[PDB]
Structure formats: structure tokens, C-alpha cells
């Protein structure tokens, strides 16, 4: 049964750094991808990275600096994390499976936002 | 890297009606996109990959066309559920991205 | 179709030997590059993926790089084990092409 | 284990048809593309064409289009590659290979079949 569930912090302040985690079931890490996607209140949908199947890493070239992104196969989590935040980066930050190029199952998002 | 933009931002229609939805690349992403559905505060739900195949479960009054980096998405006779914003996201090479969007609203 | 032009043919090296193999394509491939090893009795392997991905199994004695047209496979310390028929095979656009291949013989 | 089980009929006549079996194990076919891949005689590798069997997406090289059917039954976990009109030309090795790990990039085949050899007659 395929399931990814983020879970996040809820509100951090500005430069404290931050992970969020992705449960995944219903299927192995090595035959898909899990890409971090994030939504600005009042906005599209943003590209941060991916992580294949395989282990390697590909990130916005925007954040590249600021993010990174591994994942623990045994435990089938994986997990994004973020320097030095903005308060810009308040989001609904979400993972998906990638499938055969395609993000065919979404989770349902977690909310960050940057406080003070 | 490689930029989608979506024509229109916005589009007011009527239930019946058949609509039209664009995604134009920087570059060739050899057919290389896909189309999501977020209907208000949900996540997006997958409905065309590889500009034509239809995700399971997805009517077939959805139909995805293109190539180059000309790309579209037609709904044919809207129904009421179908009201929301559109994604299109090409998967050509990394950084993958995301078309602006459209915000499909009823007249 | 893009063309892959894969020198030499063939060759004889001795135990211990450094060789190199190249490859080129009739246009950039932006490295998706992959290598085969084909031993003698037809089992075929995927050594290298992805220009200089190696892949799980397979001896650090065996380099890839490149880069646009250009790309290269180098054995080092050359092993007994080795004598086989390296391919590479362009992954960028369909249809997947393969270079004509190189002989590998120990003297 | 992951393995790909080849077999068919090896020696046939001139303008005949044939039909070869690429059995998975080890994984599900309706989770990967099975590619077909032949081998001429002291030649180099040619890709024939693919099957995405959750799907039925079939992608040809245009030069085998007409000339190779692939076909396959995710009840079987098996997939298929008929070859129609059988020429003298037609006398190679034939593979299936597939993609099992999604690897960074695209286009790596990390398993393969053993071939199967085709004399045309
Ligand atoms: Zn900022
Ligand atoms: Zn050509
Ligand atoms: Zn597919």
C-alpha cells in the first residue's frame, strides 16, 4: 500500500537550521525516486531536489548551497535538510515517488513556517 | 536549465465547456512532461505522464498533446470537479520544473 | 539516430596494463553514458552508467569520463578476468544506440 | 533472485516467423520497461525496441517496426518478440535486458537474458 508521510517542526526562527522526514511504505527505495517539492503560501509548486534509487542527489541549483537531502534505506525514510533559513521559506513542503519519471504518489505536506 | 511556461494564469469557464491548457519549454524535453490536478488544499494528483498516457483512475475526458516544447492539456466537457489549478513538470533532466500554473475557476 | 563511434576495435594489452577505450557520439549526449562488458560466453554487464557511475560489483580499476561528444573507459591494472567486449550505449534519445564495440585480448 | 529466463526457437527456415520468451523471477514485469536487444555475428549490439507492461507503451526503432511484435503477459511474467518473414539477415543473438534500480540518468539496462540464438535457414 503506498504511503509518504512528512513530518516537520511546525515553525522554526530565522538561520536555525531544519529537517523534515518522509516515511515511505508499500515499496523500496531503490526502484524509485523521492523528489522534495515545496509550495509558498499563495503559489506554485517549487523543485528542491531528488534522491534516485540508486543513492545520488540533484538539487534546485538555487538552493543547492542550503540544501541536502539522504535517506536511510532500512528504515525507508528520507529526509531534507535546509541552512540558514528565510523567512521566504515558509511552506508546505512535500516528498514524492517518483515512478518511471513521473510523480505518481504525493504525500500530503507539512507545513513550515520561518517565525522570529 | 530548462523553463516551462503556462498559458493562461487564469481561466473563468462553465461547466460543458471544453478548455485548453499550455506548457511551453525552453527546450526540447522530448515529451518528457507530465500534468497535475491540486484541487484546494490537497496535494497534486497525477493525470498525464509522457505528454498522452493517462494516469489509472483518470478520465478519459482529459487528453495530454505535444511535442517539442509545445505541450497541452484539453478537458473536454467540464464537470464540476474538475475546477482547480494545473501543473504541468517536465522530467527531461534535473532540475526538474514546474510550469506556473493555471487556476481554473467557474464562470 | 545518434551515432556512436567507439575506437579501437580491437586490441592486446598484458597483465597489469593501463588501457583506454573511446567513445563518441554524433552529438552531444549530455553523459548519459553507459558500458557493457560482454564476456565470452554472451553474459553481458552494465559497468558504468551515467558517464562515471559504477555500478555495485565492479572493480574501482574501471574509470569512466567525458563529457558533450567525448567520453572514455580506463582499465587499470589489467586482469585476466578481463578479457571481454566493452560496448557503450547512449541513453539521451530513442531509439538506445550501442558503439560497434572493442575486443580486449590479454598477450 | 533477480534472473532472466531465455529461451525459443533457435533454428528455423527462411521466411518463417518465430517467437522468443524472456521469463522474469525474482521481480514483477508490470514494474519495468523489458527492452529486446540483438547481436549480429561478430557485430555490434542493436537495440530493437521496449514494452512498459503496466501500460502496453511499445517503443520501436523505426528499422525493426513491422519486422519485431513485442508482447507481454504480466499473468506469466513473461514478455515476447516475434520476428515475421525471416531473412538470412535475422540470424543473431537475441537478449532481453531490463532495469530493475532506478539509476541516476537514464537508459542503463543492469540485467540481461543469456541470448538466444536464431538461424535462419
Ligand atoms: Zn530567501
Ligand atoms: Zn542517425
Ligand atoms: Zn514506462
Known amino acids: 500500500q503506498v504511503q509518504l508521510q512528512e513530518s516537520g517542526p511546525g515553525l522554526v526562527a530565522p538561520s536555525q537550521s531544519l529537517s523534515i522526514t518522509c516515511t515511505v511504505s508499500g515499496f523500496s527505495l531503490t526502484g524509485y525516486g523521492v523528489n522534495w517539492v515545496r509550495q509558498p503560501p499563495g503559489k506554485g509548486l517549487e523543485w528542491l531536489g531528488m534522491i534516485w534509487g540508486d543513492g545520488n542527489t540533484d538539487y534546485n541549483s538555487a538552493l543547492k548551497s542550503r540544501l541536502s537531502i539522504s535517506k536511510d534505506n532500512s528504515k525507508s525514510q528520507v529526509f531534507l535538510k535546509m541552512n540558514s533559513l528565510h523567512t521566504d521559506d515558509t511552506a508546505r513542503y512535500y516528498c514524492?515517488?517518483?515512478?518511471?519519471?513521473?510523480?505518481?504518489?504525493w504525500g500530503q505536506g507539512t507545513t513550515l513556517t520561518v517565525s522570529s | 536549465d530548462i523553463v516551462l511556461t503556462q498559458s493562461p494564469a487564469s481561466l473563468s469557464a462553465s461547466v460543458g465547456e471544453t478548455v485548453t491548457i499550455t506548457c511551453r519549454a525552453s527546450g526540447n524535453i522530448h515529451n518528457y512532461l507530465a500534468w497535475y490536478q491540486q484541487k484546494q488544499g490537497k496535494s497534486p494528483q497525477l493525470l498525464v505522464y509522457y505528454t498522452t498516457t493517462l494516469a489509472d483512475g483518470v478520465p478519459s475526458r482529459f487528453s495530454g498533446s505535444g511535442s517539442g516544447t509545445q505541450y497541452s492539456l484539453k478537458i473536454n466537457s467540464l464537470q464540476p470537479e474538475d475546477f482547480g489549478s494545473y501543473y504541468c513538470?517536465?522530467?527531461?533532466?534535473?532540475?526538474?520544473?514546474f510550469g506556473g500554473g493555471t487556476k481554473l475557476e467557474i464562470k | 539516430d545518434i551515432q556512436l563511434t567507439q575506437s579501437p576495435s580491437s586490441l592486446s594489452a598484458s597483465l597489469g596494463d593501463r588501457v583506454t577505450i573511446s567513445c563518441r557520439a554524433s552529438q552531444d549526449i549530455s553523459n548519459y553514458l553507459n558500458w557493457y562488458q560482454q564476456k565470452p560466453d554472451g553474459t553481458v554487464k552494465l559497468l558504468i552508467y551515467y558517464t562515471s557511475r559504477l555500478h555495485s560489483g565492479v572493480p574501482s580499476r574501471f574509470s569512466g569520463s567525458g563529457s558533450g561528444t567525448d567520453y572514455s573507459l580506463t582499465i587499470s591494472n589489467l586482469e585476466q578476468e578481463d578479457i571481454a567486449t566493452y560496448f557503450c550505449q547512449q541513453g539521451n534519445t530513442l531509439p538506445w544506440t550501442f558503439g560497434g564495440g572493442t575486443k580486449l585480448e590479454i598477450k | 533472485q533477480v534472473q532472466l529466463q531465455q529461451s525459443g526457437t533457435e533454428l528455423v527456415k527462411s521466411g518463417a516467423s518465430v517467437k522468443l520468451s524472456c521469463t522474469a523471477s525474482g521481480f514483477n514485469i508490470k514494474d519495468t520497461h523489458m527492452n529486446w536487444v540483438k547481436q549480429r555475428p561478430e557485430q555490434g549490439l542493436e537495440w530493437i525496441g521496449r514494452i512498459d507492461p503496466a501500460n502496453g507503451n511499445i517503443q520501436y526503432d523505426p528499422k525493426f517496426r513491422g519486422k519485431a511484435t513485442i508482447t507481454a503477459d504480466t499473468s506469466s511474467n513473461t514478455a515476447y518478440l516475434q520476428l515475421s518473414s525471416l531473412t538470412s539477415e535475422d540470424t543473431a543473438v537475441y537478449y532481453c535486458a531490463t532495469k530493475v534500480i532506478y539509476y541516476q540518468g537514464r537508459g542503463a539496462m543492469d540485467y540481461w537474458g543469456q541470448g538466444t540464438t536464431l538461424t535462419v535457414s
Open positions: 513538470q517536465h522530467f527531461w533532466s534535473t532540475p526538474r520544473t
Open positions: 514524492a515517488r517518483e515512478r518511471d519519471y513521473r510523480l505518481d504518489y
